[PDB]
């Protein structure tokens, strides 16, 4: 009867507390999604267990086997009852799992090491000196793969064939790549994460230009799940009550170090 | 067979063509939602008829009769099969009708006549010289009435008791009131509309401060409607292909006058 929640270690959504080793169960974690999970569980009246997705991925379908990985896969194959994480609502995912209305609004953005001569996606697309990539098994990579927009189509063509690979396994890896590239690598990631990192030491990265698109994160459940309806209404109530905005300020700027 | 679409005459979403009198059916109208309706119908494979909501309202439930008015009412009582308009996804509405994922992201904002000494909601709430209101039967009015947030609570207490009434019947009425008030009336409306009006002559209004909240517009259908699934997937596909961004640029800035 305990709801199995699949989530991912991605700051500031879900992070291990400093003293996590002395703690047990859900108490080991903290963050925006940890707080959200507690609120959702309270309003929907259920007990839960936070579990970190096995493969550390958000979710994409293997082109050859057609098997889903990441948190999406855990929902699709019955390993988890709900995903509470910064998981983007997309067409390909909506076809296999259900999503609540968005609890956060965002868009793809460009992260650069401060000083990098780039101000837009068009800039990145018209040069080669600065390499750029995105997160593997994430919605941004899939967005570029499917976009028929001239600029993004050109960017995808470059990224998919780039050697060495410009893709990374985790957001952390992408950020580290930007910071150690001395400005020779730009990273495409959602504005939420870009803005968070810009507020973290060593304060050497920044979001440049506007967002490339507009999308949202939603709480996901297996298609047809009974929890779906209640969770959706809970998200709408939490947003209207200002709770979601309070959580973003709490985890993004109240704890900012820049 | 033919899907009855309820919508509202709200520029630039739906407007009467200059020569509408000499045109038939759907050809009489133009605008963002007219363009969107054609695309949604094409992608979902259905024929449709655009109809303007009888009472010219978005939708609220009367406190005494418990009867829903506006486009929400048209769906609730079976007068329309779908609503394609700048209709905000809200908890109270989601309890009686279904909504697709957002096709537009926005938030409540403040419109002032240029020169008005107001920079935020906090400013409005602490003074009385400048009156302020919002749209009747709209989601913004409902937001303020249900808000437990100190500042918004104070603002509702004022608006609810202000005499003469600070509420208006249509967005156009609110804008006209701001323009003829010599700066003594501020208007609370969604950022989308605020931004649009900011681009229309005589270019005497502007949006000030940040948005008060974060929400979205969704395509609505009667609760449990069979059209729901297809329409939602169509919205996601159209957003991912940049169609929604193209439509906003088309109707907001390409046709801008300021
Ligand atoms: C977080 C996060 O931050 N940036 C990304 C990205 O895919 O660029 C993601 C993953 C994405 N929300 C998804 O694949 O659901
Ligand atoms: C448009 C529009 O622009 N501003 C508003 C508002 O309620 O402030 C609205 C109506 C609202 N989207 C709704 O009640 O659905
Ligand atoms: Zn709560
Ligand atoms: Zn006319
Ligand atoms: Zn199309
Ligand atoms: Zn066609």
What spatial form of chain A do the alpha-carbon principal axes imply? globular
What is the CATH topology classification name of the largest domain in chain A?
Answer: D-Maltodextrin-Binding Protein, domain 2
Cα radius of gyration of chain A in angstroms: 18 Å
Main interface: chain pair and counts: A-B, 29 and 29 residues
Oligomer: homodimer
Instruction: Work out the count of structural domains of chain A.
Output: 2
Order of helices and strands of chain A: EEEHEHEHEEEHEHHHEHEEEHH
* Main beta-sheet annotation of chain A: 4 strands, mixed
What is the count of β-strands of chain A? 13
CATH architecture name of the largest domain in chain A: 3-Layer(aba) Sandwich
- Give the names of the bound compounds: the ligand Cc1onc(C(=O)O)c1C[C@H](N)C(=O)O, zinc ion
The residue fraction in helices of chain A comes out at 25-40%
Number of helices of chain A: 10
Instruction: Describe the strand arrangement of the main beta sheet of chain A, using strand numbers.
Output: 9-10-8-11
Strand content of chain A: 15-25%
N/C terminus separation of chain A: 43 Å
CATH superfamily of the largest domain in chain A: Periplasmic binding protein-like II
